[PDB]
Amino acid sequence: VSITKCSSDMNGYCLHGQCIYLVDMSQNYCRCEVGYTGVRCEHFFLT
Amino acid sequence: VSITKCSSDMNGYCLHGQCIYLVDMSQNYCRCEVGYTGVRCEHFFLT
Amino acid sequence: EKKVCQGTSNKLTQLGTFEDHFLSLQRMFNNCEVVLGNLEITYVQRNYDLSFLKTIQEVAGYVLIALNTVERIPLENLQIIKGNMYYENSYALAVLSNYDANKTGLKELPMRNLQEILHGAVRFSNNPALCNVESIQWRDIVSSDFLSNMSMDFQNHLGSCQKCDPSCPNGSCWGAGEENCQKLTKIICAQQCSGRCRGKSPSDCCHNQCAAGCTGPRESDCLVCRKFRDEATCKDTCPPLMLYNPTTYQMDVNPEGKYSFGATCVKKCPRNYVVTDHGSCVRACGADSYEMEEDGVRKCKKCEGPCRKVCNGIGIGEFKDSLSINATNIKHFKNCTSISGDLHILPVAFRGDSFTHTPPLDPQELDILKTVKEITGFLLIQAWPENRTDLHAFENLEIIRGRTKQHGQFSLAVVSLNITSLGLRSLKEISDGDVIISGNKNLCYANTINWKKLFGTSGQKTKIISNRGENSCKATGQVCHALCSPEGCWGPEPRDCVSH
Amino acid sequence: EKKVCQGTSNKLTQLGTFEDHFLSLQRMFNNCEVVLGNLEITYVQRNYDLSFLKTIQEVAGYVLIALNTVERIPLENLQIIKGNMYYENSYALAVLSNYDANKTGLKELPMRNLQEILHGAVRFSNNPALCNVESIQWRDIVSSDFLSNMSMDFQNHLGSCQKCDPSCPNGSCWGAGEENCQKLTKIICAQQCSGRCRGKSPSDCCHNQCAAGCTGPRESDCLVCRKFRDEATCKDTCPPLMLYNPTTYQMDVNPEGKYSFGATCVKKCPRNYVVTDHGSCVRACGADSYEMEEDGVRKCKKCEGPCRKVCNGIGIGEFKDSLSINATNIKHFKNCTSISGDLHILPVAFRGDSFTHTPPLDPQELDILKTVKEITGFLLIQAWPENRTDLHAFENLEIIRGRTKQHGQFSLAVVSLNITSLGLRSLKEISDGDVIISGNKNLCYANTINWKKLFGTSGQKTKIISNRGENSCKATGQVCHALCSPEGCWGPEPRDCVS
Numbered sequence A, B: 001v002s003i004t005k006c007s008s009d010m011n012g013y014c015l016h017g018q019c020i021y022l023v024d025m026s027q028n029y030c031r032c033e034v035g036y037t038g039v040r041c042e043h044f045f046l047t
Numbered sequence C: 001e002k003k004v005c006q007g008t009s010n011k012l013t014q015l016g017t018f019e020d021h022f023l024s025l026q027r028m029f030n031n032c033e034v035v036l037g038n039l040e041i042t043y044v045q046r047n048y049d050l051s052f053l054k055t056i057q058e059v060a061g062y063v064l065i066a067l068n069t070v071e072r073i074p075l076e077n078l079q080i081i082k083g084n085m086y087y088e089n090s091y092a093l094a095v096l097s098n099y100d101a102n103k104t105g106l107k108e109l110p111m112r113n114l115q116e117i118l119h120g121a122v123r124f125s126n127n128p129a130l131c132n133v134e135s136i137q138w139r140d141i142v143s144s145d146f147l148s149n150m151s152m153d154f155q156n157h158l159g160s161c162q163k164c165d166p167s168c169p170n171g172s173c174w175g176a177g178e179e180n181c182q183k184l185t186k187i188i189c190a191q192q193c194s195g196r197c198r199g200k201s202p203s204d205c206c207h208n209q210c211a212a213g214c215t216g217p218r219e220s221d222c223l224v225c226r227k228f229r230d231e232a233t234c235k236d237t238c239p240p241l242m243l244y245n246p247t248t249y250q251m252d253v254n255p256e257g258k259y260s261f262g263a264t265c266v267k268k269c270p271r272n273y274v275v276t277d278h279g280s281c282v283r284a285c286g287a288d289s290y291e292m293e294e295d296g297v298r299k300c301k302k303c304e305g306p307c308r309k310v311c312n313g314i315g316i317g318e319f320k321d322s323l324s325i326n327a328t329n330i331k332h333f334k335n336c337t338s339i340s341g342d343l344h345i346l347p348v349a350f351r352g353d354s355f356t357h358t359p360p361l362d363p364q365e366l367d368i369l370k371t372v373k374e375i376t377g378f379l380l381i382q383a384w385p386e387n388r389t390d391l392h393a394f395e396n397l398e399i400i401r402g403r404t405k406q407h408g409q410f411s412l413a414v415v416s417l418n419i420t421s422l423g424l425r426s427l428k429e430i431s432d433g434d435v436i437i438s439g440n441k442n443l444c445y446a447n448t449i450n451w452k453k454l455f456g457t458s459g460q461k462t463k464i465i466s467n468r469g470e471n472s473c474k475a476t477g478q479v480c481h482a483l484c485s486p487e488g489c490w491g492p493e494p495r496d497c498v499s500h
Numbered sequence D: 001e002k003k004v005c006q007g008t009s010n011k012l013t014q015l016g017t018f019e020d021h022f023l024s025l026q027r028m029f030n031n032c033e034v035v036l037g038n039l040e041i042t043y044v045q046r047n048y049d050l051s052f053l054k055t056i057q058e059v060a061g062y063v064l065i066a067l068n069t070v071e072r073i074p075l076e077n078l079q080i081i082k083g084n085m086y087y088e089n090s091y092a093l094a095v096l097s098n099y100d101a102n103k104t105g106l107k108e109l110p111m112r113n114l115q116e117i118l119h120g121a122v123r124f125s126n127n128p129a130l131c132n133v134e135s136i137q138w139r140d141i142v143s144s145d146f147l148s149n150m151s152m153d154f155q156n157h158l159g160s161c162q163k164c165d166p167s168c169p170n171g172s173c174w175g176a177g178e179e180n181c182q183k184l185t186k187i188i189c190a191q192q193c194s195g196r197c198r199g200k201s202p203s204d205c206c207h208n209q210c211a212a213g214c215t216g217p218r219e220s221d222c223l224v225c226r227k228f229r230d231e232a233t234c235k236d237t238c239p240p241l242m243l244y245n246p247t248t249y250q251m252d253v254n255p256e257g258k259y260s261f262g263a264t265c266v267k268k269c270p271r272n273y274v275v276t277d278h279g280s281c282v283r284a285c286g287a288d289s290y291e292m293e294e295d296g297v298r299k300c301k302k303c304e305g306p307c308r309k310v311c312n313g314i315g316i317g318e319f320k321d322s323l324s325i326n327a328t329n330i331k332h333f334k335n336c337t338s339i340s341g342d343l344h345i346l347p348v349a350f351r352g353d354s355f356t357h358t359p360p361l362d363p364q365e366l367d368i369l370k371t372v373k374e375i376t377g378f379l380l381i382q383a384w385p386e387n388r389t390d391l392h393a394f395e396n397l398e399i400i401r402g403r404t405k406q407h408g409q410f411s412l413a414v415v416s417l418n419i420t421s422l423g424l425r426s427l428k429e430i431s432d433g434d435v436i437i438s439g440n441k442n443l444c445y446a447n448t449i450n451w452k453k454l455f456g457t458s459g460q461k462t463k464i465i466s467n468r469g470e471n472s473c474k475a476t477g478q479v480c481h482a483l484c485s486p487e488g489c490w491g492p493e494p495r496d497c498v499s
């Protein structure tokens, strides 16, 4: 209702995470694994 | 009389002028000759 | 003097189970009162305490508050958004989509002490449970030049919120209690007044260099400084080191003159930074200029002749939004000896990124970086060619200065590699910043080096964990050569030894 | 913008007859609106028109109105006395002993527009006919500090001076009429005013860089700028050429950037002055620097390492109030190649002065001036060893920049010498300022040179007068050598030909 899941084309948007779709902005972002930060799960973060 | 002649201990004060004593201020200044300026009549100016 | 935190630019991106996200927010903005980047309150679930948010008083970038089912967000003493970077290139603040499945999300945002946003606008949308935000008059806070890009979905479907106390003028309040009354300081001053006064009283009118307001007329009484601050005063420009004498037509030294660093006027530039002749601390000298050391001072000097390539770092200039070095930008580092910035080596380069239209990177081209001896910022290596045993391309790298540091802390990071050794034989100085060596499953010789002799600041720490165990490496014979064990070794060979 | 004049520092010394004194003062302050130095009105007698003083609007040094018997001194439009220099080390404005034997003298000093004296105190004494000025409340005009030692002895014996118009505030005026009422811009101000005010109402304050007053409430509304004037906007410092960026720890370019020239902010430095990388127009680069021409402008550039010795000229530094180079100060010119300033050689140096406690100059010590190749100001030679025939020590002088001028006009003065030839062999440029060569009774080889080729600024003049006649010089054989080009010669010998 507030998030959905991303298309098949967006397989590699999240380097270290899973893609999310935000419906109110009509945008797409990432849910990063533990220990990785950045909009695309870019860099490893201290702990 | 408010302007007088300076004492003899002031012969060489005016380089190109005559020494005058201002009593109202108790100070020794100069009356410069023509073509000369400055407090002690140091400099030469074109008239 | 004020406590300092960097900030986050993850935007609407989440880190882990919402727990871990909350832990990261708490860890970053705990005991922080000046935010040097962006303040991002995202994915904050209900029954979670946001008490530390009370400490924040100043934010340089944008403030985003989104996707929060937590009821209260206590940004009560925040006083300024400098808007030095925007959200969606237009919004200095944005409170968006803080709602729940049963319409039970954000409810309270008592920003009673926000008075100015120098650059940017704000945008409000999908705020179903937020109370009393409708009452706020944003013409005071935002500069006029931005009132156009100012978006405003102030609508409350719930409509079950306590109205504004009589002490709140025009019925404008950020919450309930009369302390949440929207104090105004912009237009309600006087015709002669230009600075943001205390009130309509022309006597109670503030300096231009005041930002939010003032407790008194002089510039020492400014609540927040607009541009620079010198000790306790606010200034448009930091006091020059030498001033013009109109009478003598010559330059004369200024006693109150101090150097320019960031938004501060400091008597001494930091050591790793460079000093320009104008009297300011710079991170990099412009083109046709170089860095030397003269009489105790690292200074920029104009060069005519040899000089060098500009060699800007990743994230800067040419590499504006570049995540890593790769085929599209690898050619620009041909004969770079010093790197004016940072280097990021990430796995996406070797895999390739279709979204940024980046083709895969040939490992052999990394050798181009053998000519680099100096990096002014930080070096981050998260990926390396599997076939190689060491960081061969940085065998001639000698110094990392740590002017810019990863997450504000690390100047050298080597993570997630199959390398057996490091091979940084020419490395001698890490001027500032900490060194993390982690996740390197086959690395052994890193623990022999006394990194403290490569550090230029007391307090620089080394975090070497999650690599191949020292006992295992000793058992396999992966230890320093015996002819060279005074100080350590970057690998098995005598050449990889340091003191020898 | 405003017409300038140099000023006079003769103090109470009289220059010739009363008429000659008046003529010099008229020459100096005619059409002048800004006195860059001191305004000295002395020994001006009755029936002499002082109307040309109405144009003066600003004085930077001091104002000394003394020993005048003239009835009126029309300083009607004088607004500010900056007080950069003080009379007797404590007074910016001093009106002293303006009377005659019949106790006739100065009656009217209609300074109806004098609202501030930045630095300095005021002194009035022994002016027995000065009318109406006693009523002035100098506390509005003077700075708060210097008010400490202000000497006010008002005593108009006559009392037959008209009374101030009733409209004048607190009965204070400068003279007869509503015209000459006093204007108050300090004491009448509002509570906790920034600087000054145009009115009594709290909204009538001025900007803190307004000096005399304001037409409104803004920095562009100031009557006079306190520190700097960036083309009709009063400012503390001229806009820096570059601005620091707090977000990006690097320097950026200021479009509003502006060079400094005196109290003015200018988009380009004047012709002869040299620009620093600071964005400042100076008259001389320091010993740490040297002048050169980059991109068509002379600028200061930091030294490579082996720069040439630069020495302060006469009048600056250890030579503060020294009249001439002399046995006490000659030592400090040993190895100098450039002179930041002036060089005066007067007969008092060779003759010795008792009052400056200075012995006579050994002539051959002059020889340590052969190392001098550049002078940023003027060369005033009024004396020279009578038994030497040219200016030997200045044989290797190469350029006279003339950034500072004698009397504001001359950069090379050679007066009253027995030298037979000039002997300025290495001189190649007189950048600015006129040249005077006068009173040298034995001098030849002066009109031969095309002085215009030496000059570097249009409008430079040559005045060669009262020397040995050209016809006489040619009659007994004092013409340039045969080897000399038609361009001229500095002397008789072959090494004296030009270019």
Ligand SMILES: *[C@@H]1O[C@H](CO)[C@@H](O)[C@H](O)[C@H]1NC(C)=O
Pocket: D026, D027, D030, D031
């Ligand atoms: C003063 O200037 C005016 C014109 O500006 C001129 O007519 C007058 O002769 C000048 N007087 C002197 C003494 O130069």
Ligand SMILES: *[C@@H]1O[C@H](CO)[C@@H](O)[C@H](O)[C@H]1NC(C)=O
Pocket: D089, D090, D121, D146, D148, D149
């Ligand atoms: C008058 O006061 C000023 C204040 O700066 C001081 O310099 C000066 O010496 C004083 N006058 C005398 C005669 O001391």
